[PDB]
Design a protein around this nucleic acid. Structure first.
Ligand SMILES: Nc1nc2c(ncn2[C@@H]2O[C@H](COP(=O)(O)CP(=O)(O)OP(=O)(O)O)[C@@H](O)[C@H]2O)c(=O)[nH]1
Ligand SMILES: [Mg+2]
Ligand SMILES: [Zn+2]
Ligand SMILES: [Zn+2]
Ligand SMILES: [Zn+2]
Lengths: 47, 179, 59, 176, 57, 601, 101, 100, 115
DNA sequence: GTCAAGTACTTACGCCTGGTCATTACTAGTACTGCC
DNA sequence: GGCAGTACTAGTAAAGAAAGTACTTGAC
RNA sequence: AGACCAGGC
């Protein structure tokens, strides 16, 4: 029922934070489960 | 959406909480096979000590604090607990939901705590008694589930794939799981 | 040309611009030329010395 | 009319400058920026001064050398915020600019400003009471109300600033 | 209008006949094998109403 | 995807919103008006569904950005509907507010102190204040002196509770929206809408309104107010209503009750302070899609236009019908009757066109699929094209068993060791084995099929000769002739070698160990995959003609996870029970019964 | 790598202040100028808004008007661009607030 | 300028609130199977894009084998930012985390 | 394995508009590379070896003054077993526009074939 | 106000390969021919 | 020699045997 | 791109 959860989402003006894996594939984000549950920070030597 | 967090507390993608700890003990299914098989691991003690390597894995841990509180409650529960569950004024948390089980050596569940010390008292057998219970707890801590495991996929495939082994007066089988 | 390896992605202003004099320009050019040679921007560098020798010399 | 701007930018860093995070920002995003017009700054960038990389952890002091850059998940290039003081040259209307002659054409006085910046004074901005002698041998000189040949410097106002093309140019009028 | 019936299998009739289904009345006789070819002339289908149906009996 | 063309901007959130008719008169490229698509000799007619302002079309440059088919992304456009018409996605929620409101004072038919009680419980639910919203009910013919006093204390109780919790680290001014406050919000609105529709008389001015009727879609009716209760109308001292009439009612309702609908249509607090309007439920202006997304399906010469044009053609036909019907209003008693009865018939049919464009089931009429039905089910857009996609760099072939494979490998044919390829950027260590991989060519294994230059130039290798092919081998590790691309390096699309990583997969992918990651050992003879017997217990595969997929990953974040994380060595124990799935199956077990017997010497 | 990178990967220009995939579009440059990416919704017609020589751009129609140059590239799936096209036809507006502002 | 400065100083201060200090971090000291598969992965993308290599190359040409070699002698300059469900994080370097 | 496709040169027009495309070679500069696979009538030889890219049949078009060749759109190499000439049922006797052709393919039993 | 009888509405395993078929009536028009 | 009848032509217009909850209506 | 038909596991 994709356009019954579409009307209920726009009549709430709902702002979803793109957390579920089904919502991060629609918009192309990296999935939050597993390897994409953190970031990788490269240390650089100079300031 | 549900997955293990870094709190050892599995929860959904938005942040709502489903369990405070995975199965109450936070250990992976694919690693708890030989965990209660003590007489297997006793006979292979010198071979398992080469891969868990105790003295190289004390230095990033705390051995002192969790083993105390695991004896503060086991002394409490074995003296008490002739009475049923509604009578127990508990006075103590279970030792696994107070300290971090993946950092504090000795934070074990209350069946791995009993079945270790029961096996370590039903018989008496060169490896002594103290080098063995300091290796099962090193094995238990390393058998912790990793933070980030897709639990609810594994939990939906652990029901959905054996459900297709029924095909391919109480109600029974696959029409029961629909209800 | 004009990719994310040539240009900043987002660019803004920290604070409102305030004017400088000839001293702040010439103390810059005794340091910005100093900290550059001592790298194919030399077509911009030659146009810097036509401003460094503007306030000091003559074309 | 040189003015100073402190800016905040969001630039990328390449793995070949993972040993020198400072000059990697220089050779990609700052050195291809000098002597070009920039819309978000205001004029032509003369240079930069004092690059400082905003470190990702808020617990390390700004004295420390080992900073750290967030890596994009797809690509191995790191993105970071940085502070630097640009010195930019912005000409604005109403101001008076010294204009040093570069080309004597019969339709325009197309000159240089500070020996780098081109400028334009059209013939219709030049008033009608000035004349221009022809040049048959080989582009001569404009004759003002002084009756003298023009040479070099001129202090004139700003009519328009055209920046859309290759280099900057300053349109100047002669009414004041 | 008959060659359209044989080439498609669809049953275009303004008074829809006394049987349930409306499509799949003609099937390409293969001649991919003689066992395949003789099998088309003995096959009996119940209907396309009954295929799209979640019963067993 | 190119790993050397990075991106720096990330879409962090989305938020749904009504697209009003003012923006799509400004967003647009060109308003399109005639119900014809293309004239004789294939040209797109101007002002039509195919216009050069709406994007490029069939080897003809765009008139908005001036690009061809390869680069013009397509551009938006709108049409002008002369009547406001119902948006069928919002009709059932409109018919709640179409009813439940007095047609005289333009409030809802409840008392305004109880409608205010939902205007302040929902404000507490926008912030993370689920528990304080039940305390708010504990504040307690009747004059307006204490009703104004009751609304004052409730408004001060909410304003004390928000600023307390927002200062006591609990809720940001963006709100705190979780699942169990979405539970109580949906529980409250469905109690709010249930109680609005249960009203006899307006409790602000005590008289009736006639009952409405929803025949279906495309129509709206209000019934006859009876003779017993028009008496209460006289002591204050059946009919097809239009769509301009209903919009004019709800324009007044949302202004007299602006304080309540700001919290019904907002789950997080409205930081933008926009006004919820009655034009939201209507749509005075349709939006035609860009013409890239409705290109005609070419089948040799059998060219049929995409059927969204065929739905929008019927919208434009009625829209230019109904304007000429309004020309006869400018001409003008008998002629008054017949031209207005057909005008009122045309009011229905233009709604029936905008329904049929949006939803093919909300329009009476084999039918043409509307824009709802290109989203819904399997064969939709989410399930068929978002949750699961066709993929590049992948193969599928029948499997044959193979011993003498090291149990963590798959054996690829030469017909798969030539087509499939991997982007390797050249470095100071690759130029031995990747200079030789580019000399061998696209047909010699190990080989290469393309070179991507630094500049994005993609040089093929199929048509080249071997003497020309060695010249590009020496130009490979060269510095940049451009300042802009000095930090890049050439990518050689090499063939798949003995070190690459491969994701094998077999349907139905029931458990997670039916989709593993293997190494490759490239086999020389035939066109079938070679699987070892220990893997077939976990793929559930027999060799009676099973074929199974072969996905070949394209970057080093994905080679490092089918070797370490989706590795087939790490898939020894299935996580259902902890029991293993990998092991020798049929002949290697019956050999051990004879080999470990007492007879074997 | 399966569902995004090697199926329908695209880098599309996105407006920072709109948050809209299929609004911004190419500007038709002058002779000798470079072309820039520019937004339609947060623009304003030049006859309406009475300027600084660089925010002014032009279509291929000839309608020259000032506009918002607040746009940048975001790596999305291409079916997201088709999602907004069949969702703006419904009258729904998706808004894509990117992170670096 | 003045409006962007408030948008920056709110951004850098809330992100300072999310930073758990180095003594008060309470997650596991063992690098997980998921963190290893990306420390090897993201470093392997860097070496192929001409990063400086801190290990002696014994003729290995696969960049992922280089990153697997660099993990053995703790020569990888990457930091894991272990996010928490509240949004807060912990910063663990690779040399601090112990494997397996 | 015997495969058959129908080359039909009259898929475009209707009702007496003239035959714009003829079989055979015309008088443009068409390359001599496809005499090996084609006869003088623009039709292939019986028994030739045809893989992908080789021409199946040649035809001359009048609205372009050019000999376009159709090509073998299949990756599996085949031999040509027979070529039909299909006339039309009409009172006005017409130049041919329809040629049927039959391919044969050696399916020597590779591994992976189901027995 | 509360409880009904009846409606209206949504779901229904995964992947893969081949083939065929595809708008119809009619209506007004330009041209063909029989005719005086 | 030119008029009108038909036969065609290309032209542009209409197309009855599955299960759960939500829902308004409705007697009372 | 569909409608149907024939399959494969
Ligand atoms: N999800 C589905 N799986 C299928 C379907 N048809 C076949 N299969 C798969 O293919 C396999 C078919 O097995 P069979 O029907 O031949 C039963 P059989 O006793 O002949 O197996 P063997 O003993 O291995 O020969 C089985 O493992 C199924 O998982 C289907 O329609 N859906
Ligand atoms: Mg099988
Ligand atoms: Zn365009
Ligand atoms: Zn009223
Ligand atoms: Zn904008």
């Amino acid at each position: 029922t994709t356009c019954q959860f579409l009307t209920k989402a726009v009549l709430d003006n709902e702002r979803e934070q793109l957390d579920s894996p089904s919502a991060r594939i629609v918009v192309g984000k990296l999935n939050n489960v597993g390897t994409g549950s953190f970031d990788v920070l490269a240390k650089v030597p100079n300031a | 959406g549900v997955h293990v967090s870094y709190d050892n507390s599995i929860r959904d993608a938005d942040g709502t909480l489903v369990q405070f700890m995975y199965g109450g003990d936070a250990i992976d299914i694919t690693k708890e096979s030989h965990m209660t098989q003590f007489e297997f691991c006793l006979d292979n003690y010198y071979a398992l000590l080469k891969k868990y390597n105790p003295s190289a894995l004390i230095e990033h841990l705390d051995v002192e604090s969790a083993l105390k509180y695991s004896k503060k409650t086991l002394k409490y529960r074995k003296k008490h607990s002739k009475e049923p569950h509604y009578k127990q004024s508990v006075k103590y948390d279970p030792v696994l939901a107070k300290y971090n089980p993946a950092k504090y050596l000795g934070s074990v569940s209350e069946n791995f705590q009993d079945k270790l010390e029961s096996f370590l008292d039903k018989n008496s057998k060169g490896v002594n008694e103290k080098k063995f219970r300091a290796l099962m707890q090193l094995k238990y801590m390393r058998s912790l589930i990793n933070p980030g495991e897709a639990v609810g996929i594994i939990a939906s495939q652990s029901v959905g794939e054996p459900s297709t082994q029924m095909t391919l007066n109480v109600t029974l089988g696959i029409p029961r799981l629909r209800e | 040309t004009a990719t994310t390896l040539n240009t900043p992605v987002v660019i803004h202003a920290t604070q409102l611009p305030q004017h400088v004099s000839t001293d702040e320009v010439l103390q810059f050019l005794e340091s910005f030329i100093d900290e550059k040679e001592n790298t194919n921007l030399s077509s911009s560098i030659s146009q810097l010395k036509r401003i460094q020798r503007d306030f000091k010399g003559l074309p | 009319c040189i003015v100073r701007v402190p800016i905040a930018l969001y630039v990328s860093l390449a793995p070949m400058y993972l040993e020198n995070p400072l000059q990697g920002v220089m050779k990609q995003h700052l050195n291809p920026l000098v002597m070009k017009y920039n819309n978000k700054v205001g004029g032509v960038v003369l240079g930069y001064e004092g690059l400082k990389i905003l470190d990702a952890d808020p617990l390390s002091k700004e004295d420390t050398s080992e900073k750290l850059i967030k890596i994009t998940p797809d690509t191995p290039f790191g993105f970071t915020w940085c502070h630097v003081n640009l010195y930019v040259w912005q000409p604005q209307v109403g101001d008076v600019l010294e204009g040093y002659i570069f080309i004597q054409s019969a339709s325009h006085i197309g000159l240089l400003i500070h020996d780098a910046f081109n400028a334009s004074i059209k013939k219709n901005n030049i008033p009608v009471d000035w004349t221009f002698v022809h040049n048959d041998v080989e582009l001569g000189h404009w004759v003002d109300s002084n009756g003298e040949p023009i040479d070099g410097k001129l202090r004139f106002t700003v009519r328009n600033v055209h920046t859309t093309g290759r280099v900057v140019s300053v349109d100047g009028t002669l009414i004041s | 209008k008959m060659q359209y019936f044989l080439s498609t299998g669809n049953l275009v009739s303004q008074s829809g006949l006394d049987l349930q289904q409306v499509s799949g009345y003609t099937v390409v006789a293969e001649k991919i094998n003689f066992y395949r070819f003789i099998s088309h002339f003995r096959m009996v289908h119940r209907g396309s109403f009954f295929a799209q149906l979640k019963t067993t009996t | 995807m190119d790993i050397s063309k990075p991106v720096g901007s990330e879409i962090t959130s989305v938020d749904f919103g009504i697209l009003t008719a003012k923006e799509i008169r400004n967003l647009s490229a060109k308003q399109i008006t005639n119900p014809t698509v293309l004239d004789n000799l294939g040209h797109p007619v101007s002002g039509g569904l195919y216009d050069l302002a709406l994007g490029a079309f069939l080897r003809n440059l765009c008139s908005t950005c001036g690009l061809d088919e390869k680069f013009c992304p397509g551009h938006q456009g709108h049409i002008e509907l002369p009547v406001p018409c119902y948006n069928p996605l919002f009709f059932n929620q409109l018919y709640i507010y179409l009813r439940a409101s007095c047609l005289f004072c333009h409030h809802f038919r409840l008392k305004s102190v109880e409608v205010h009680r939902y205007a302040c419980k929902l404000r507490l639910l926008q912030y993370g204040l689920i528990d304080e919203s039940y305390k708010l009910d504990e504040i307690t013919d009747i004059s307006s002196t204490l009703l104004n006093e009751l609304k004052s204390k409730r408004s001060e109780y909410v304003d004390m509770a928000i600023a307390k919790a927002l200062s006591d680290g609990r809720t940001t001014e963006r709100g705190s929206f979780t699942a169990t406050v979405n539970d109580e919000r949906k529980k409250l609105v469905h109690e709010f809408h249930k109680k609005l529709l249960s009203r006899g008389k307006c409790d602000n001015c005590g008289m009736f309104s006639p009952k409405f009727r929803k025949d279906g879609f495309t129509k709206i009716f209000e019934t006859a107010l009876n003779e017993k209760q028009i008496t209460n109308n006289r002591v204050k001292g059946s009919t097809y209503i239009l769509s301009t009439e209903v919009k004019n009612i709800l324009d007044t309702v949302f202004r007299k009750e602006q304080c309540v609908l700001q919290y019904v249509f907002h789950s997080r607090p409205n930081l933008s302070r926009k006004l919820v309007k009655a034009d939201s439920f209507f749509m005075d202006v349709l939006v035609v899609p860009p013409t890239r997304f409705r290109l005609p399906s070419k089948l040799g010469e059998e060219v049929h236009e995409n059927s969204q044009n065929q739905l929008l053609s019927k919208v434009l036909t009625t829209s230019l019908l109904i304007r000429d019907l309004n020309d006869d209003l400018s001409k003008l008693l008998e002629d008054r009757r017949v031209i207005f009865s057909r005008l009122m018939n045309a009011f229905v049919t233009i709604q029936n066109d905008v329904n049929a464009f949006i939803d093919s089931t909300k329009a009476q009429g084999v039918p043409i699929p509307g824009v709802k039905q290109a989203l819904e089910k399997k064969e939709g857009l989410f399930r068929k094209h978002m949750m699961g996609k066709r993929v590049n760099y992948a193969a599928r072939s029948v499997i044959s068993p193979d011993p003498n494979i090291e149990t963590n490998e798959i054996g690829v044919p030469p017909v798969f060791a030539v087509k499939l390829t991997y982007p390797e950027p050249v470095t100071a260590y690759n130029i031995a084995e990747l200079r030789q991989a580019v000399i061998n060519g696209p047909d010699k294994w190990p080989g290469a099929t393309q070179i991507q230059n630094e500049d994005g130039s993609l040089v093929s290798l199929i048509g080249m000769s071997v003497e020309q092919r060695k010249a590009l081998a020496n130009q490979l590790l060269t510095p940049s002739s451009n300042v802009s691309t000095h930090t890049l390096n050439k990518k050689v699309y090499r063939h798949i070698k003995n070190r690459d990583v491969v994701l094998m997969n077999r349907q139905p992918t029931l458990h997670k160990a039916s989709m593993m990651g293997h190494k490759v050992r490239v086999l020389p003879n035939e066109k079938t995959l070679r699987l070892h017997y220990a893997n077939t217990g976990a793929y559930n595969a027999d060799f009676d003609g099973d074929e199974m997929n072969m996905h070949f990953p394209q970057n080093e974040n994905a080679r490092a996870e089918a070797l370490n994380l989706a590795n087939t060595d790490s898939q020894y124990l299935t996580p259902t029970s902890g029991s293993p799935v990998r092991g020798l199956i049929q002949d290697h077990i019956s050999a051990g019964v004879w080999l470990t017997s007492k007879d074997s010497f | 790598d399966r569902l995004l990178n090697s199926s329908d990967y695209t880098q599309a220009s996105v407006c920072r202040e709109c948050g809209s995939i299929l609004t911004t579009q190419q500007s038709v440059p002058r002779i000798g100028s470079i072309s820039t990416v520019c937004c339609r919704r947060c623009s304003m017609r030049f006859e309406d808004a009475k300027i600084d020589d660089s925010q002014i751009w032009e279509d291929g129609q000839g309608n020259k008007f000032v506009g918002g140059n607040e746009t940048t590239t975001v790596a999305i799936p291409f079916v997201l661009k088709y999602l907004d096209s069949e969702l703006s036809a419904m009258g729904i507006r998706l808004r894509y607030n990117v992170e670096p502002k | 300028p003045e409006d962007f400065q408030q948008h920056e100083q709110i951004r850098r201060k809330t992100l300072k609130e999310k930073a758990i200090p180095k003594d008060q971090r309470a997650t596991t000291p063992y690098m997980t199977k998921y963190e290893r598969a990306r420390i090897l992965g993201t470093r392997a993308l860097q070496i192929s894009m001409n990063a400086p290599v801190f290990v002696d190359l014994e003729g290995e040409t696969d960049p992922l084998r280089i990153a697997m070699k660099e993990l053995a002698e703790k020569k990888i300059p990457l930091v894991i930012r272990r996010y928490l469900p509240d949004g807060s994080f912990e910063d663990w370097s690779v040399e601090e985390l112990i494997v397996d | 394995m015997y495969k058959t496709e129908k080359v039909d040169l009259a898929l475009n027009r209707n009702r007496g508009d003239p035959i714009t495309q003829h079989f055979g070679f015309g008088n443009d500069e068409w390359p001599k590379e496809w005499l090996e696979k084609l006869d003088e009538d623009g039709l292939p030889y019986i028994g030739t070896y045809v893989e992908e890219g080789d021409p199946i049949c040649a035809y001359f078009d009048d609205t372009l003054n050019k000999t376009k060749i159709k090509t073998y759109h299949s990756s599996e190499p085949a031999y040509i077993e027979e070529v039909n000439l299909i006339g039309d049922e009409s009172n006005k006797f017409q130049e041919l526009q329809t040629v049927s052709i039959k391919y044969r393919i050696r399916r020597t039993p590779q591994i992976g074939d189901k027995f």
